[PDB]
Design an enzyme around this catalytic site. Structure first.
Site, mmCIF file in Angstrom:
data_model
loop_
_atom_site.group_PDB
_atom_site.id
_atom_site.type_symbol
_atom_site.label_atom_id
_atom_site.label_comp_id
_atom_site.label_asym_id
_atom_site.label_seq_id
_atom_site.Cartn_x
_atom_site.Cartn_y
_atom_site.Cartn_z
ATOM 1 N N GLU A 107 17.122 0.886 -8.885
ATOM 2 C CA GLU A 107 16.625 -0.048 -7.861
ATOM 3 C C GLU A 107 16.209 -1.350 -8.547
ATOM 4 O OE1 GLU A 107 14.496 0.569 -3.771
ATOM 5 O OE2 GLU A 107 13.112 1.041 -5.401
ATOM 6 N N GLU A 136 8.383 8.468 -0.441
ATOM 7 C CA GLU A 136 8.249 7.606 -1.632
ATOM 8 C C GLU A 136 6.804 7.114 -1.745
ATOM 9 O OE1 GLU A 136 10.775 4.194 -1.767
ATOM 10 O OE2 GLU A 136 10.523 4.007 -3.953
HETATM 11 O O1 LIG Z 1 10.586 1.050 -3.802
HETATM 12 C C1 LIG Z 1 10.891 0.598 -2.712
HETATM 13 C C2 LIG Z 1 10.024 -0.418 -2.041
HETATM 14 O O2 LIG Z 1 9.192 -1.086 -2.960
HETATM 15 C C3 LIG Z 1 12.186 1.011 -2.027
HETATM 16 O O3 LIG Z 1 12.649 2.244 -2.527
HETATM 17 C C4 LIG Z 1 12.017 1.079 -0.513
HETATM 18 O O4 LIG Z 1 11.032 2.062 -0.189
HETATM 19 C C5 LIG Z 1 13.307 1.426 0.233
HETATM 20 O O5 LIG Z 1 13.011 1.645 1.612
HETATM 21 C C6 LIG Z 1 14.374 0.357 0.128
HETATM 22 O O6 LIG Z 1 15.565 0.767 0.807
HETATM 23 MN MN LIG Z 2 11.840 2.556 -4.634
#
Ligand SMILES: O=C(CO)[C@@H](O)[C@H](O)[C@@H](O)CO
Ligand SMILES: [Mn+2]
Ligand SMILES: O=C(CO)[C@H](O)[C@H](O)[C@@H](O)CO
Ligand SMILES: OC[C@@]1(O)OC[C@H](O)[C@@H](O)[C@H]1O
Ligand SMILES: [Mg+2]
Ligand SMILES: [Mn+2]
Lengths: 286, 286
Positions: free
Chosen positions: B245, B151
């Site tokens: 999210e 990510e």
């Molecule tokens: O975007 C994010 C963090 O800002 C999330 O996707 C985290 O990387 C993740 O680890 C949360 O579980």
């Molecule tokens: Mn994220």
């Protein structure tokens, strides 16, 4: 309120990462070359500034100066440690004294807390401590004909106020005639419900503006809705300072740059960036 | 590369701040109720999860699971301290094992460094250590039919890669068929030159997507150009996980929430938020 006019500035870090005799001249020459009305000096350590040298440079280049700063953990006026609040009070008075000696009228930025990442949410006590410090600063600045402008910044840079609407509530608690809201398009792009709401709510309470792209690079190469923002400024007939603010790993202030997590090169040519920024802003507002 | 399908998921923190027996049931029942295909379990401490109980809940509610995590200072695989890299390798192996046991095929998130605000830029050694760690993890995951998706997150959350283009150069050095880019609209809104460039560049190397509003609240109430983003996904015919999210002070994970500086209440009603998000996404994609 001390006099404000529509005027266009560049933040020192567009040109220079230090305020040595060489660094001060590089920033002031750069701002003047691009045709800015003023330079915004980063006053994170106001004891470091050579005031006589800086005044001579402002006169040499026919340029005005405003000042911005962020506090640090050692000077955090939100602190429940009374000694730390007192060190913050002292730094802000020194910054005010420097700005006065340079004939400036605006002290802006993150003057109400430690700039950077808090380990948890702010308490009512953290907020009350900050409001009282901003009352004490506003009163000190008023004796020197200086306005203070409280910059709303994103969640990674403060836990006190992350939206214009939260900033206006804080400002009203400060309740001083020479205290204003400072909005920054880079921070607004993260936290705001669109780019107009906070400007329209602020009206005459908006005293300072930073123009930054979503990634703090070249204007018009990112995600910020400048059209909506400048439309809102027009609606409230905003006539105050507008500073172009941009950070690139090309030019590092060892403290500020790392606090702002400037890992990337967004530009290499200060004159090209600063010239294109001023044209971009004047095309849309003035 | 293990099979990917177009499927819609909710991040656990939409419903639960902990993965207790109760938290797991609340989150799994919530994601099922809203009509999601999978739940994305946050595995910051993969030893804390009752895997057998979670498996029974997934079967009970006919839900799939994928997993995301961020490392911490103690487990940072970019570290020049080999003992810290070893702890990170061990955490990532355990997370892979948990994901395999839940019948999941995607380990995503900030798996290549400590999630949070680095005090300075990454050295060549930090980046080299991260690449090597992702090779070892990719090879471990490959034995259990699992893809890893790295990510890209903003400057305040990593110093290793803040744009899709930087992530793709990193993945070229990793050079593993089951290692993919993971893009998140919240992070892209800060760092990217518009919402299309990185998606078009990634093509088949885009393995995972997070949908987050600019302020991480209700979709459509912020600044993210979703029209541009979903158009780009269509242009590469993206067929992989899409997770909604969102973070509010309403639902707090003691660690993750403070790392992500979630100071504000952006919502209170998990079911309303998650239902409206899924409708928002499906109206624009698939
Ligand atoms: O975007 C994010 C963090 O800002 C999330 O996707 C985290 O990387 C993740 O680890 C949360 O579980
Ligand atoms: Mn994220
Ligand atoms: O937007 C900012 C920080 O993100 C401020 O303008 C900055 O901290 C100034 O105080 C620098 O002088
Ligand atoms: O002063 C802190 C504050 O602004 O932090 C953010 C919250 O949304 C608000 O209610 C306040 O607690
Ligand atoms: Mg079972
Ligand atoms: Mn600013």
């Amino acid at each position: 309120a001390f006099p404000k006019r529509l005027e266009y500035g560049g933040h020192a870090l567009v040109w220079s990462g230090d305020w040595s005799a060489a660094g001060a001249r590089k920033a002031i020459a750069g701002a003047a070359r691009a045709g800015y009305d003023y330079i915004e000096i980063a006053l994170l350590d106001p004891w470091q500034i050579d005031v006589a040298l800086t005044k001579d440079l402002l006169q040499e280049y026919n340029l005005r100066a405003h000042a911005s700063l962020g506090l640090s953990a050692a000077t955090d006026v939100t602190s429940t440690d009374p000694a730390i609040v007192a060190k913050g009070d002292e730094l802000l008075r020194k910054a005010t004294d420097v700005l006065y000696a340079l004939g400036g009228s605006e002290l802006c930025g993150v003057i109400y807390c430690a700039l950077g990442k808090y380990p948890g949410p702010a308490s009512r006590e953290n907020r009350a401590n900050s409001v009282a410090a901003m009352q004490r600063l506003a009163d000190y600045a008023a004796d020197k004909g200086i306005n203070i402008d409280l910059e709303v910044v994103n969640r990674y840079e403060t836990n006190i106020m992350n939206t214009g609407l939260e900033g206006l509530a804080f400002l009203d608690e400060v309740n001083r005639p020479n205290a204003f809201l400072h909005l920054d398009t880079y921070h607004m792009n993260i936290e705001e419900n669109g780019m107009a709401k906070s400007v329209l709510a602020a009206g005459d309470r908006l005293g300072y503006v930073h123009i930054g792209e979503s990634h703090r690079g070249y204007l018009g190469t990112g995600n910020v809705d400048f059209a909506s923002f400048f439309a809102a400024l027009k609606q409230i007939d905003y006539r105050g300072p507008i500073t172009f603010e941009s950070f690139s790993s090309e030019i590092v202030d060892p403290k500020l740059s790392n606090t702002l997590c400037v890992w990337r090169n967004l530009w290499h040519d200060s004159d090209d960036l600063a010239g294109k920024a001023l044209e971009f802003i004047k095309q849309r507002y003035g």
